[PDB]
Design a protein around this nucleic acid. Structure first.
Lengths: 189, 124, 56, 155, 252
RNA sequence: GACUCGUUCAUACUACAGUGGAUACACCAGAUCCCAUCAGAACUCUGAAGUUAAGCACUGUAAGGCUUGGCUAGUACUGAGGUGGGAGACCGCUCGGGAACACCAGGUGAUGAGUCAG
RNA sequence: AGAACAGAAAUCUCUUGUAGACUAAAAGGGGAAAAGCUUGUUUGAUUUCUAUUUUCAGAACAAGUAGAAAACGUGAAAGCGU
RNA sequence: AAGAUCUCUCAGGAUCGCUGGAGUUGAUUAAUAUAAUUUUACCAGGUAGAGAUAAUGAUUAGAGGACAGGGCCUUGACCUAUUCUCAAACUCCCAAUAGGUAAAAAGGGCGAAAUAACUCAAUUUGUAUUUCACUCAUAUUAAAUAAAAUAACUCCAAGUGGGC
């Protein structure tokens, strides 16, 4: 059905988005995006891992969807649904077109740069190896080279864990859904 | 003090929403009610109104009298009786908005407010 | 203040600006040497022909 | 395919952010004498006298003046040859240039300096300096103030 | 949404300060200034008239890049010195004011003896252009009276007759600059009521000018004029915020 | 102190406050005539009885905005060289040039001509 | 946010409103004391002639830009209108 | 040379371009003209980039609030501060490279005097020209550097206009 995908590892040609000029695109494969315990407070979790790009890879929309489902299933089997949040940190947005003259729209794709997170897991400290393993399962569903990492941040914040604790101690940091708002001392109360 | 809330404009509306004659009769009724020639709406002529000032306006308001809920936020009001009425109120210095050299905003603490306008209406 | 510049490279396959600079510099035949007065302007011109010249 | 008068002018002729709105009144007062140098900068708050694309950002001598028009001699590269073109524009687009003013300022400063020098019979190199090499010098650095460095480890 | 969004401030482009304030037109000014560009050092002198509630102000203006130079200027409250103590907002006053400015300008040039202009009411002279000055050029407006006074004085300012009374009455213009209608209104009001007459033209009553006398006084004055022209700082503010915060924590 | 013409065209804006009215601005008083309307609201004309309430001026605000400066960052990017590296994607080195947003700190005006009033 | 019939729309009023409207028609530019909308007066959508720009051979047509000699139109006037 | 414009034109032709010869003019005075160059001035820019909390279009989430359906509550819409990722035909901002103009003697200075039917209010108010004066670097040359005049310019004509 689809082209065999060895065609699209190279990410030449300009970007070309779903747009008023182009029209008519088939649907993106992934509509799911984030999953897990999505409503969890910033206080509850504190561990974070990332699966990070290196090639300049294109990343098929379908591949992305598959990777997400694989990741999710691995966490759910391991630590269940109280204990994590899986956030896809990339999107398809670029249209690919083919002949049966100029092509016709046929699929969509994501085009990461080097050194960018693909899949992110927010979780609790006991479960970071499990999450790392989930990402490792995920990597086999992507074209190109990727490495798994862990961070010294509180997860879904700019702040280091120690910084987060320090700010929390002196009351400068407010939890505001998903992540945290930093008080900047401006105007009346 | 100088800060006296008074009538600034009175507008009287009659709409039939249709063609001539009935519209003309309404305009004649409005004219008899107060003298000044009516002026009219659009074409998608449809409706009529006139504006009043001063002693003439006060007489129309006075006959009008014979509710707390339905004053505007801005400090104006109307009522229904067939015929429609709208009463526009201000302190003086309303001229600052329209006088051609200097056209500009009045201060917030000089705008009418709902509560003061209601208090004036009960008082009057 | 002065700089002796020695050319290092053939006639063939030379960018057009580089050829022009060489002509002004005054190094045509391939192992030609000349003294050049260090300034700002001379140094910039020298910078353009740099991969094609040794100097000191 | 097509190549009409305002072709491809989108961002070029459009105004910068917060620079919309009519040509300032003061700007009509500026002086233009014959042979003055003058830039051709497009506007679009004025429509009459708008010049063709190429003469944007070019600068030339004024050769002729009318009621609101100014003739400008501009060089144009046509294949193997520059040739002189008489672009008639209106005043809103023509701007009094500064490139000339550097030279003119230099003449004035030089004249005064030369007159004084010549009066004293003190021979002088009035011509431009054109930055030489750095001369030798002796420099005190405190031995406690100096900092020493190494390239950073990777992270 | 809230219209006074951050974005709304951020995009905003202000109109020029004088236009924002509302004093100047700009469109009229740019048209007014420009001379034909092949002419050189022809500065197109504008006769600027602005009608303030108290009094009309007549200046001779020349546009320059670092801003307008005023050569002669006259205000209506000078007419007191020339025997008119009252009515300084008036049309009659404006005609006088314009005339005074023109004569003083000529005296400064030293061309007062060169042109003695128009006597009473019915080489080439120096030229100027009337300013609209943001008021409508509606028929019978005060600026035209000022223009007429300037012209009668000696300045050449090209004009139609259209915006004097009637679509032409020269006799009505003569009555008006003399002030005869103002007198008529005074007589009319006195006949109507004595309380209204005294309350209205109260200053006139105090000075003691009968309606009849106004034209004579204005004429005498007119003849005479033609013959004879603190911030705080950041360290301090920082302190102020600290003090305010401590007090606010205690207070409520 | 104030005004008239302006200039730069947000450090000049906006929003909310406070503070100021000798003379001045203004609001404000009135409709006979010129004038203008649906309406003396505007505009026009004619006043000078009242008043700082507003306009206006001045200042304030951990103000928003705007504006300098740092810092982002020698990061991103890039001209020239390379029988350099990399299977490829792409990435170093040599001679050079070099950002932006955010963030943080300061700032919130200056001024030409003419005039009136102690 | 208010005002008989009156509702999501009808008209009227006040507040907020830098353009989110409208500008014959593609799409992009430009425009708020206007270029928009409303109103008044009009016919310069005129005759004659240059210098020229665009494409380009620096030919042509065409479309313009800047003038000049006439005669006028409008505005109080500068002006603006080929 | 395989560019270019026009061609019942695409295997052609014309006409430009690029080439040779002939000639004059100019240089022949380490020079001025001049230069596929830099310099110092001075501009003109909206691409890589960067941005989404700057506008337009996309676009994923929750948090805190005062209008629509049902029984304090639920689904919301709707706001407000946020958040994930974005655009050849989006743009607050924005490089490098490339491009233009500038760098004095047939000129420029500061003066005088003339001339005109133009200009201006101005027979002197300017303009512009013209004529006289006075005087600007030059013993490295009004910034370098230059087998920089082997230059200009005219004529007559070729071949070429499939390219890679």
């Amino acid at each position: 059905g689809r082209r065999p995908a060895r065609c699209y590892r190279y990410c030449k040609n300009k970007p070309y988005p779903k747009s008023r000029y182009c029209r008519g695109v088939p649907d993106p494969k992934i509509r799911i995006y984030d999953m897990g315990r999505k409503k969890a407070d910033v206080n509850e979790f504190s561990g974070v891992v990332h699966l990070v790009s290196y090639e300049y890879e294109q990343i098929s929309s379908e591949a992305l969807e598959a990777a997400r489902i694989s990741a999710n299933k691995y966490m759910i089997t391991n630590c269940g649904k109280d204990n994590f949040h899986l956030r896809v940190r990339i999107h398809p947005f670029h249209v690919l077109r083919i002949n049966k003259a100029f092509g016709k729209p046929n699929g969509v794709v994501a085009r990461v740069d080097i050194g960018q997170v693909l899949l992110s897991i927010r979780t609790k400290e006991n479960f970071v190896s499990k999450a790392c393993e989930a990402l490792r399962r995920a990597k086999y569903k992507f074209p190109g080279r990727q490495k798994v990492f862990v961070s010294n941040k509180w997860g879904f914040t700019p702040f280091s864990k120690d910084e987060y604790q320090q700010y929390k101690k002196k009351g400068r940091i407010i939890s505001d859904g998903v992540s945290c708002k930093f008080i900047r001392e401006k105007g009346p109360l | 003090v100088m800060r006296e809330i008074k009538v600034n404009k009175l507008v009287l509306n009659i709409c039939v929403g249709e063609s001539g004659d009935r519209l003309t009769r309404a305009a004649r009724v409005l004219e008899q009610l107060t003298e000044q020639k009516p002026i009219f709406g659009k074409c998608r002529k449809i409706s009529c109104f006139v504006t009043v000032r001063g002693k003439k306006a006060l007489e129309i308001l006075e006959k009008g009298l014979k509710r707390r809920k339905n004053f505007s936020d801005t400090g104006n009001f109307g009522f229904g009786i067939g015929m429609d009425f709208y009463v526009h109120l201000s302190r003086s210095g309303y001229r600052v908005t329209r006088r051609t050299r200097r056209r500009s905003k009045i201060s917030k603490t000089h705008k009418v407010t709902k509560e003061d306008a209601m208090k004036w209406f009960q008082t009057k | 203040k002065v700089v002796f510049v020695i050319r290092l490279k053939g006639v063939n396959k030379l960018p057009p600006k580089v050829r022009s600079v060489f002509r002004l510099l005054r190094l045509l035949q391939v192992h030609n040497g000349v003294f050049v007065k260090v300034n700002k302007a001379t140094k910039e011109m020298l910078k353009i022909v740099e991969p094609y010249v040794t100097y000191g | 395919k097509s190549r009409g008068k305002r072709s491809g002018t989108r961002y070029k002729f459009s105004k910068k952010f917060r620079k919309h709105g009519e040509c300032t009144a003061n700007k009509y007062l500026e002086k233009l004498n014959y042979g003055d140098y003058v830039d051709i900068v497009c506007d679009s708050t004025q429509q009459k006298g708008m010049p063709f694309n190429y003469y944007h950002g070019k600068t030339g001598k004024i050769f002729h003046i009318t009621k609101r028009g100014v003739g400008v001699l501009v060089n144009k590269r046509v294949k193997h040859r520059i040739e002189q073109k008489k672009v008639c524009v209106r005043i809103e687009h023509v701007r009094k240039s500064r490139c000339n003013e550097d030279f003119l300022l230099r003449k004035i400063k030089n004249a005064e300096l030369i007159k004084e020098a010549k009066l004293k019979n003190e021979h002088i190199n009035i011509k431009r300096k054109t930055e030489g090499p750095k001369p030798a010098a002796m420099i005190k650095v405190p031995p406690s103030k100096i900092i020493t460095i190494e390239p950073l480890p990777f992270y | 949404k809230v219209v006074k969004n951050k974005a709304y401030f951020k995009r905003y482009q202000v109109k020029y300060r004088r236009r924002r304030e509302g004093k100047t037109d700009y469109r009229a000014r740019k048209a007014l200034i420009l001379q034909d560009k092949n002419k050189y050092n022809a500065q197109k002198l504008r006769f600027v008239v602005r009608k303030t509630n108290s009094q009309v102000i007549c200046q001779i203006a020349c546009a320059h890049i670092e801003g307008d130079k005023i050569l002669a200027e006259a205000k209506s409250k000078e007419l007191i010195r020339y025997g008119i103590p009252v009515g300084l907002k008036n049309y009659a006053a404006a005609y006088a004011t314009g005339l005074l400015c023109a004569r003083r300008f000529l005296k400064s040039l030293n061309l007062d003896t060169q042109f003695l202009g128009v006597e009473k009411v019915t080489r080439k002279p120096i030229k100027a252009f009337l300013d609209v000055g943001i008021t409508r050029t509606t028929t019978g407006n005060r600026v035209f009276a000022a223009l007429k006074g300037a012209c009668d004085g000696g300045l050449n300012i090209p004009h139609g007759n259209n915006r004097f009374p009637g679509s032409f009455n020269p006799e009505q213009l003569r009555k008006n600059i003399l002030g005869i209608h103002v007198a008529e209104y005074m007589k009319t009001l006195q006949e109507e009521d004595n309380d209204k007459y005294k309350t209205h033209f109260n200053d006139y009553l105090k000075n003691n000018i009968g309606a009849d006398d106004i034209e004579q006084m204005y004429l005498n004055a007119h003849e005479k004029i033609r013959q004879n022209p603190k911030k705080l700082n950041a360290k301090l503010r920082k302190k102020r915020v600290k003090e305010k915060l401590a007090l606010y924590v205690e207070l409520q």
